[PDB]
Structure 1
Amino acid sequence: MRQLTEEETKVVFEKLAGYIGRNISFLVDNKELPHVFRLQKDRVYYVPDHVAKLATSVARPNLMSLGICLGKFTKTGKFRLHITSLTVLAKHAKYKIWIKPNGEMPFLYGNHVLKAHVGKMSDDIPEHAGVIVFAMNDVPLGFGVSAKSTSESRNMQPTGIVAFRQADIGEYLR
């Protein structure tokens, strides 16, 4: 357990600003449950304010996880975003993509998002901006870096990628 430096938050907020837009102001300013985030053994954990305040008594070897894990800092100095973030991410999504009921399980095994699913996506999407995958019930499935823009991906052959898989909820079987 430790508190982040000035740069270390900026690295996280930029990666979170890849999927959520400028609506990251929803994530830190609440006033009721302000939701501060800490890291243990180079892996950030998102929690309520007091639930991390009273858990400052736990030993570093004795600690395992804390609330919602976003992702870990890499050895090189970047920030990965693990699948466990989606419960916080999809509630404040900017660019959102759906899939087929038939072409759901291919995605849930680690494959990318094909063009073979056509309907109503988000608009105004850049080529390399972070998208969030929904599946009736609007069930969040995971992350994604888009393959092309919205314009290019409509006039495409159905076996071409529209969103590169990054992390899916099928990771909960490990």
Structure 2
Amino acid sequence: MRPLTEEETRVMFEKIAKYIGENLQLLVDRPDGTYCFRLHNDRVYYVSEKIMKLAANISGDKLVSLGTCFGKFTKTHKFRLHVTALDYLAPYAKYKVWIKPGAEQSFLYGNHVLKSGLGRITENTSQYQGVVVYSMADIPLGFGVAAKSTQDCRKVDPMAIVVFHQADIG
């Protein structure tokens, strides 16, 4: 465990902002205390500061399980988001896509969503905007990238790609 570098923080902040804009502060400023990010084996962990204030008291290994991994830094120093972050980011992601049964199955196996499977998408979603993919029952399935804008999604043919697969649960 250890604080992130100023340069690492920016990268992660920039990546997370692609899905929740400037709402990360919502995850850091929790009504039950401040939360922070500690690096460990190149993976970023979301954990409360109270728990961090108890290092040297815990074997660290136990400390890693007390936090939630959000993703990790690649060798090309980029931040790869992990689906374990989904439950924390989803409630704060402005741009969402709701997909049908067929698309859901294909998404859970790692594929992209096709027009025929698009049930609904948040208004004014730009092309390449980072989105959170939900099932028709409104449950989080993963992170995606809009292939076309919400406007262009209507005009496209059923076999066209409307959401690229980033990460999925399951």
* Common fold: TM-score over 0.5: yes
Cα displacement string for residues 31-77 of structure 1 (whole angstroms, at most 9, x for unaligned residues): 53211121111110012221232244445678754421000111111
How far apart, in 1, do the equivalents of 2:131 and 2:82 lie?
14
Instruction: State how far apart, in whole Å, the 1-side matches of 2:61 and 2:118 are.
Output: 49
Aligned: 1:145 with 2:161: no
1:53 counterpart letter in structure 2: K
Distance change >3 Å, CA 116–CA 54, structure 1 → 2: same
Assess, with a 3 A threshold, how the Cα gap between structure 1 residues 136 and 115 changes in structure 2: closer, same or farther: closer
Q: Is the 8 A contact 2:134 2:142 kept in 1?
A: yes
Distance (Å, rounded) in 2 between the aligned partners of 1:134 and 1:62: 32
Where does residue 75 of structure 1 map in the other structure? 75
User: How many Å apart are 1:120 and its aligned residue?
Assistant: 3.0
Please give the residue correspondences for 1:73-152 in structure 2 after superposition, counting only pairs within 5 Å. Answer: 73-135=73-135, 137-152=137-152
5+ long unaligned stretches in structure 1: none
Whichever structure has more strand as a proportion of its residues is 2
Task: Tell me which residue corresponds to 1:30.
Answer: 30
Q: Secondary structure at the match of 2:162?
A: strand
Listed as ranges, the matches of 1:156-171 within 5 Å are: 156-170=156-170
Asked if the contact 2:33–2:49 (Cα under 8 Å) also holds between the matched residues in 1, the reply is yes
Q: Structure 1: which amino acid aligns with 2:17?
A: A
What percentage of aligned pairs have identical amino acids? 56
Normalised by the size of structure 2, how large is the TM-score? 0.90
Distance 1:118 1:107, change over 3 A: closer
Is contact 2:131–2:146 with CA below 8 Å preserved after alignment?
yes
**Mean CA deviation greater in 49-58 or 91-100:** 49-58
Q: TM-score, normalised by structure 1?
A: 0.88
Other-structure match for 1:19? 19
Higher helix share: 2
Tell me the distance in 1 between the aligned counterparts of 2:10 and 2:127: 23
Change (3 A) 1:158 1:49: same
The 1-side partners of 2:24 and 2:76 are apart by 25
Computed over aligned residues only, the root mean square deviation of the Cα atoms, in angstroms, reads 2.0
- Say whether the 8 Å CA contact 2:107–2:113 is kept in structure 1: yes
Cα distance in structure 1, aligned partners of 2:62 and 2:50? 19
Q: Distance in 2 between matches of 1:14 and 1:31?
A: 24
CA distance in 2, matches of 1:52, 1:39: 12
Distance 1:34 1:56 in 2: 20
